[PDB]
C-alpha cells in the first residue's frame with residue numbers, strides 16, 4: 052500500500068522502484084493583461100523520476116508546446132506525466148522495469164494506474180512522506196537544461212553524483228532530501244552554503260559540488276541549521 | 289392469476305413475495321400464496337425466525353411451469369420445486385383455495401410499483417446470471433458472491449453479473465487513457481451496450497435484478513453491481529436521451545421502495561453524490577434527485 056515511516060527502508064532493497072514527482076511538470080507565471088485581467092504564461096517543465104537505490108534521474112523535459120491548445124492543463128499535466136512514465140517503463144528492458152512506482156502526490160495515482168494497465172504486476176503506490184522533490188528545479192543544472200530546451204527531451208544525471216562510491220543509498224537519499232529540503236525552505240541561503248567556497252567545484256556529469264567526506268559533514272550541518280533557522284522565522288519559536 | 293402452494297410450514301419463518309412479506313408461525317397451517325400477477329418475474333423469499341442469517345429465495349415466472357414450496361429438513365430450508373403433473377397440481381391448488389389455506393398477493397389496483405421495479409427483468413436473463421439450468425427457477429441468497437468478488441470462491445454458486453471495471457483494459461482505449469477514464473461513453477455505449485448487452489433493456493434489466501438482490505437479500509455484491517451500472521451511465525457524457533429518462537424512472541422507484549432504515553448499507557455515499565452532483569448527468573435525474581434529497585438528505 053502506501054509508503055510511510057514504517058517501511059522507509061524498502062526504498063533501498065534490490066527491488067527496482069522509481070519515485071515520480073509531478074510538481075514541476077506544469078509551470079506558469081501569472082500576470083496582468085493589458086485590459087487588466089489575469090492570464091498565465093506557461094514555461095518548460097520536467098517529470099522527476101528517480102530511482103532511489105541507484106540515483107539515476109530520468110529527467111523528462113516538458114516543453115510548453117505540449118499545452119498549446121488544451122484546457123484543464125493542471126489536470127492534463129497529471130495525465131501527461133503518466134503517459135510519459137509509461138513510455139519510460141515501456142522503453143526499458145524487462146529486467147529493468149520497476150516493480151513499484153511511488154507517486155509523490157495522490158492525484159497521480161489514477162492516471163498512472165490507467166496508463167500502466169499493460170503492467171498489472173507493477174504496483175503504483177502513494178506515499179504519506181513529505182519529500183522535497185519540487186525543489187529539483189532549484190538545482191542549477193536541471194533548471195538550466197529544462198529552461199533551455201526547445202523540444203520535448205530526456206536528460207540523464209546521477210542525483211547522487213559519485214556519492215555511492217563512498218556511501219550507501221540510504222545515506223545518499225537522506226543527503227539528497229536534506230539538501231532539497233533546504234533549497235525548498237530558503238533557496239538563496241541553501242545555494243550560498245553550497246557554493247561559497249569557489250575552490251570546491253561541480254564536475255560536468257554531476258549536479259552538486261565535489262565535497263570531501265568531512266566537507267559533507269560541514270555542509271550537512273549547515274543545511275540543518277538553515278532549516279531550523281527558517282522554521283523559527285516562519286512560526287516564531 | 290397463479291399460485292405457489294406450500295406443502296407445509298414446519299419452521300417459524302418470515303416469507304417475502306416480491307415487496308410484500310408475512311409472518312408464519314411454526315406448524316401454522318400455511319399452504320401458499322395465490323393471485324400472483326401473471327406477466328412479470330416474481331421472487332419468493334425467506335428468513336427463519338431462529339437464524340436471521342442467510343435470507344434466501346427463488347426468482348421465478350409462473351409462465352414457465354408450476355412451482356411449489358416444500359421445506360426440506362435434511363437441508364433445513366424451504367425449497368422451490370416443479371410439478372410436471374399439471375393435473376396433480378391444479379387439483380392441489382384448488383383444494384387449498386377451497387380450504388382457503390393461502391394468503392392473496394395483495395395487489396392494490398393503482399400500484400405499478402413491482403412492474404416498475406422489474407420492467408426490464410426477464411427470467412431468461414436471470415438464469416444466465418444464476419446458472420443452475422436444470423431448474424426453471426433461480427435460487428439466490430445473502431452470502432452468494434459475484435464473479436467480480438471471486439476475482440478479488442465456488443463457481444456454480446456465483447452471481448455471473450457482467451464485470452464492470454473502470455481501470456481495466458476493457459474500459460480504456462490505448463491513446464485515450466485520459467479521455468475514456470474521465471468520460472466513459474466508449475465503455476458504456478460500444479463495449480457495454482452494443483457489445484455485451486446488445487440493447488439498453490438488457491442493461492436496465494441486469495441493473496434492476498442487482499438492485500432487487502441487494503434489497504431482498506442484503507446481497508452485498510449485487511449492491512456493488514447496481515452502483516457500478518448507475519455510475520457507468522452517470523460517468524458518460526453521451527447517453528441516449530431515452531436511456532437517461534428511463535434510468536431516472538428506474539432509480540426513483542428503487543429509491544421509493546428502499547426501507548428507510550436500510551439506507552446506510554444499500555446506498556453508497558460516494559456514487560450518489562457523484563452521479564447527482566458531479567457526473568455528466570447531474571442534471572438528468574430530476575425525479576431521482578428530488579426523491580433522494582427529500583428522503584435521504586443525510587447521505588448527501
Ligand SMILES: COc1cccc(C(=O)N2CCCC2)c1
Pocket residue numbers: 107108109207208209256257
Ligand atoms: C540515467 O542513468 C544513468 C545511468 C548511468 C550513469 C548516469 C550518469 O551518471 N550520468 C549520465 C550523464 C550524466 C551523468 C546516468
